[PDB]
Design a binder for this molecule. Structure first.
Ligand code: FES
Ligand code: ZN
Lengths: 162, 82, 43, 175, 212, 162, 8, 38, 101
């Protein structure tokens, strides 16, 4: 990739960009006719949020998503990976891609609650005080609708609402 | 109060002399030069309506200036309701 | 909360009913039986 | 900033419309009038001159003077005093290509055409479309025999407009 | 170098002397007995009249049944006349004046115009494109008592082409028409005689475009 | 809208007889899309090529300059001063101008046309008069030029003027 | 060195 | 703010943003353009 | 350009841009010159001068910015895009302006 560094010596600021090692795609894709790296390796409908090995290749060092025109993914699969990365951080599966903390900030101790398949941000969810009748039940969303067409090895389809 | 200067109405004088050409008070009217003294490109211009798109040669600037002008009209009408 | 005015399955405001997955399969199973019945009555 | 407006030659007045315009900028109204009137002294009074005003940060002005408007040239060339209310439907005056060439020969000396250094062919073409706005029709050749007849019939049309114009004023009073 | 395209010309189109929508009387001057049978399904079923363009190119398509009273006519007339250019646009009425009287006791008052699904309510046209009129026509169609949508000659044609396409490529081997006509499973006991022709696309005054 | 409560036997009939769109085995976007059908060249584009060829043929001195975001009053004032020395300011789109140079003698001017560029041309190489006009604005750079079909840089123009 | 039906 | 069912920008400086589970309209130039999804 | 005109080159004293046009690694440097030499940016500070000197020595392009405080800003555009140069340049404006007042 490319790196940017600034060195200040003698009240003079110098900004330079140095090229570092760039990783290379593995040769001989199973499906060279594929348009995006997903179906080139026949990974469509075959990855989940816990597959951090696939997700780590499309994220920045601070956990941010990469642009679609850089990775080369299609719009359909970029959105799926976008949600899988969000659910990976919320499950604590990417501990090395934490947000950058500015100097002079020490995070306080907060209730550590284990979670997974978390569709929404925890801070932006209101409690379900009234479940409602059986025919009008207020369900709790689990997972993501963007992963509905994934490969299911059981006869029962994925239940996205509990 | 302020008005344009009075212009004479004389069929002979207007043909022979152009009043608006002269602007200085001490100056005199400029009589029209004969036909031969005028250049060749003066009597070949389009006096009537502008040429349509079908009458313009595609390999010409005036062909695409008209077409680009029409496309500006289309966007304005579409944006008018907006 | 959740009162249904009048009676459940009769009247104007009735309790909503929904078709399950096996309800569709049972009807399709019946339809295939009758579809084959139309074949043997054609000859 | 730069302010552009049409000012009558030798008839600048301290009041509106250009008065408050310079008042907002803070430039001296009297100084502008004195310079413009004495600089346009040779030019006949009442000639519309598009003027360009340059405003310095210290409220100092350096006026710029250009050629008169084309409509002034066209109306004078055809003898018309007031342009047609509706162009196209009726023809106000009549000008020849010889008149247009003499108009374009001096109109090309203005700042706009001089900076572009376009050929005189383009200047004549743009004036042809300008006469259509005033209702004047461009004819390649014209003689005195028919010029006095068309102008004779134009006056009849002008007299008709006076009756209609006065009728609206009379109707407005009755309201 | 941006790729330019020629624009269509509307010079050959003529504008009527009264482009604006005419005033709609609140009530008919003289009531008249209808010739239709007393058993009336005026808002139920597909429309059998005013289903095609006549003069203009754009119209508001009705996707449901309902009654239009004088208030609805005023809403369309005032909105369309204000929002359109009379020089390049014109509109005509595709529905008759309110004629069916609705008499409700307060403890014949007002007339209404019944409209079936698939009927054009107001048709427009002239020296204009569809995008220009799609703005207010959707605004007007939103205020109608039934499901309405602004359509043009191309959009309406394309919509019917898509419906025909859906029936052909439908992978479901079971259709409402096949089961209803053949009385499979004794389904006619819970169906209606009108359902033999509606083919499951209509339920009361509502139309279902997604039903094949 | 299902206003009336449908009979359950009728409701099941509606659910069973639902439209099922055909699903292809492989998604069309994943397959290699056919090449875009060719179109006819724009008449304006081929008009520029004829106009560009005349510029490189009639005049021998062509000066390549970057059309900086100068004010229109200042940019027109410079154009008039260059007109006093018979120096034109030709500007052509690079998407038509680059392919012309790709098949031409002046094939090494391709890197010079990157961004906003303008061409200064004149029948007679009045280099010395042009440089002094460009010295008024220090932020207007002369990328290069070609005099008598010879490729030269800005330094050569300084040497050519002297 | 990956078959056509290979999946990581 | 103003609870609106259909959020709509009222000028060029308005920008839609998704915060606390609902879409908001923020406008620094015109504070009266602020909207909240209802 | 629009983002930079909001801040203004108040502390900036001298701006110099050098690059080799024939080289194929000066696109970012030229784009930075295009935005800086705009009318909006230069109108904010008439005293701040913009210098563009062309060289054909085959050297990597760089930008030198001199401020009133005396600090110098060096941005080598060989491997820095136009946005990165503008973002780094604009940030130094706020830091120097805060120190000045
Ligand atoms: S194009 Fe095939 S999954 Fe992306
Ligand atoms: Zn706003």
């Amino acid at each position: 990739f490319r790196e940017v560094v600034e060195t200040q010596e003698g009240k003079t600021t110098i900004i330079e960009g140095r090229i570092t090692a760039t990783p290379k795609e593995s040769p001989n894709p199973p499906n060279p006719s594929g348009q995006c790296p997903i179906c080139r390796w026949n990974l469509k409908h075959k990855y989940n949020y816990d597959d951090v090995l696939l997700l780590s290749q499309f994220i920045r060092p601070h956990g941010g998503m990469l642009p679609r025109k850089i990775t080369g993914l299609c719009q359909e699969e970029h959105r799926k990976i976008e949600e899988c990365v969000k659910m990976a951080h919320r499950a604590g599966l990417l501990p090395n891609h934490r947000p950058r903390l500015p100097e002079g900030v020490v995070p306080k101790s907060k209730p550590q609650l284990n979670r997974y398949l978390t569709r929404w941000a925890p801070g932006s969810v209101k409690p379900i005080y009234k479940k409602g009748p059986r025919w009008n039940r207020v369900r709790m969303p689990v997972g993501s609708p963007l992963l509905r067409d994934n490969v299911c090895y059981s006869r029962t389809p994925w239940k996205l609402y509990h | 109060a302020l008005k344009d200067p009075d212009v004479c109405t004389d069929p002979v004088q207007l043909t022979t002399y152009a009043m608006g050409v002269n602007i200085y008070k001490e100056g005199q009217d400029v009589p029209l030069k004969p036909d031969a003294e005028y250049p060749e490109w003066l009597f070949e211009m389009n006096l009537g309506p502008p040429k349509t798109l079908e009458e313009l040669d595609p390999e010409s600037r005036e062909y695409w200036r008209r077409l680009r002008k029409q496309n500006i009209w289309r966007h304005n009408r579409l944006s008018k309701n907006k | 909360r959740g009162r249904i005015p009048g009676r459940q399955w009769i009247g104007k405001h009735r309790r909503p009913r929904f078709v399950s997955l096996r309800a569709k399969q049972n009807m399709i199973r019946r339809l295939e039986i009758e579809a084959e019945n139309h074949y043997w009555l054609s000859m | 900033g730069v302010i552009r407006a049409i000012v009558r030659a030798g008839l600048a007045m301290p009041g509106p419309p250009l008065g408050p315009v310079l008042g907002q900028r803070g430039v001296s109204i009297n100084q502008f009038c004195k310079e413009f009137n004495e600089r346009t002294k040779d030019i006949k009074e009442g000639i519309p001159l598009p003027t360009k005003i340059l405003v310095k940060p210290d409220r100092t002005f350096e006026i710029k003077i250009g050629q008169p408007t084309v409509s002034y040239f066209l109306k004078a060339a055809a003898g018309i005093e007031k342009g047609a209310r509706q162009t196209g439907k009726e023809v106000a005056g009549l000008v020849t290509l010889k008149h247009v060439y003499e108009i374009a020969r001096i109109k090309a000396q203005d700042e706009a055409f001089a900076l572009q250094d376009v050929p005189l062919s383009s200047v004549v073409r743009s004036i042809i479309g300008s006469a259509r706005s005033l209702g004047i029709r461009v004819v390649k050749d014209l003689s005195s025999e028919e010029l006095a007849a068309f102008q004779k019939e134009r006056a009849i049309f002008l007299a008709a407009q006076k009756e209609a114009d006065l009728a609206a004023q009379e109707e407005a009073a009755k309201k | 170098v941006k790729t330019l395209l020629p624009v269509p010309s509307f010079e050959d189109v003529s504008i009527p002397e009264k482009p604006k929508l005419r005033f709609i009387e609140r009530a008919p001057l003289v009531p008249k007995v209808r010739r239709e049978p007393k058993n009336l399904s005026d808002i139920r079923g597909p429309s059998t009249e005013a289903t095609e363009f006549t003069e203009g190119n754009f119209a508001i398509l009705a996707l449901g049944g309902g009654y239009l009273h004088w208030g609805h006519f005023e809403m369309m007339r005032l909105t369309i006349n204000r929002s359109m250019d009379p020089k390049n646009m014109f509109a005509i009425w595709r529905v008759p004046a309110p004629f069916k009287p609705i008499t409700r006791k307060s403890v014949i008052d007002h007339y209404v115009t019944p409209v079936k699904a698939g009927r054009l309510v107001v048709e427009m046209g002239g020296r204009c494109e569809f995008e220009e009129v799609q703005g207010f026509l959707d605004q007007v169609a939103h205020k109608l008592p039934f499901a309405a949508k602004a359509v043009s000659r191309g959009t309406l044609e394309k919509m019917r082409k898509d419906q025909e396409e859906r029936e052909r490529n439908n992978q479901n081997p079971w259709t409402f028409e096949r089961i209803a006509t053949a009385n499979m499973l004794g389904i006619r006991k819970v169906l209606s005689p009108y359902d033999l022709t509606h083919k499951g696309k209509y339920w009361g005054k509502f139309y279902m475009p997604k039903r094949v | 809208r299902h206003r009336r409560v449908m009979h359950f036997q009728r409701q099941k009939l509606m659910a069973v007889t639902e439209y099922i769109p055909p699903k292809p085995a492989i998604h069309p976007s994943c397959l290699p899309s056919p090449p875009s059908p060719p179109q006819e060249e724009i008449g304006l584009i081929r008009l520029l090529r004829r106009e560009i060829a005349a510029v490189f043929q009639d005049n021998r001195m062509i000066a390549v300059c970057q059309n900086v975001a100068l004010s229109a009053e200042d940019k027109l004032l410079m154009r008039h001063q260059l007109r006093k020395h018979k120096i034109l300011m030709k500007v052509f789109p690079n998407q038509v101008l680059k392919p012309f140079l790709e098949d031409s003698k002046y094939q090494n001017l391709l890197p010079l046309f990157v961004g906003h560029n303008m061409l200064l041309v004149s029948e007679e190489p009045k280099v010395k008069e042009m440089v002094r006009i460009l010295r008024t604005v220090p932020f207007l750079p002369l990328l290069g030029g070609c005099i008598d079909d010879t490729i030269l840089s800005r330094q050569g123009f300084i040497n050519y003027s002297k | 060195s990956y078959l056509p039906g290979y999946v990581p | 703010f103003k609870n609106k069912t259909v959020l709509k920008k009222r000028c060029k400086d308005c920008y839609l943003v998704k915060r606390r589970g609902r879409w908001y309209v923020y406008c620094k130039t015109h504070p009266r353009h602020k909207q909240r999804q209802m | 350009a629009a983002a930079l005109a909001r801040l203004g080159l108040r502390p900036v004293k001298q701006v110099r841009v050098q690059f080799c046009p024939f080289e194929k690694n000066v696109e970012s440097t030229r784009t930075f010159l295009q935005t800086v030499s705009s009318e909006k940016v230069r109108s904010t500070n008439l005293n701040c001068s913009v210098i563009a000197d062309v060289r054909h020595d085959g050297s990597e392009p760089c930008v030198d910015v001199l401020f009133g405080d005396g600090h110098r800003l060096i941005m080598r555009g060989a491997h820095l895009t136009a946005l990165e140069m503008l973002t780094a340049f604009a940030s130094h404006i706020r830091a120097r302006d805060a120190a000045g007042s």
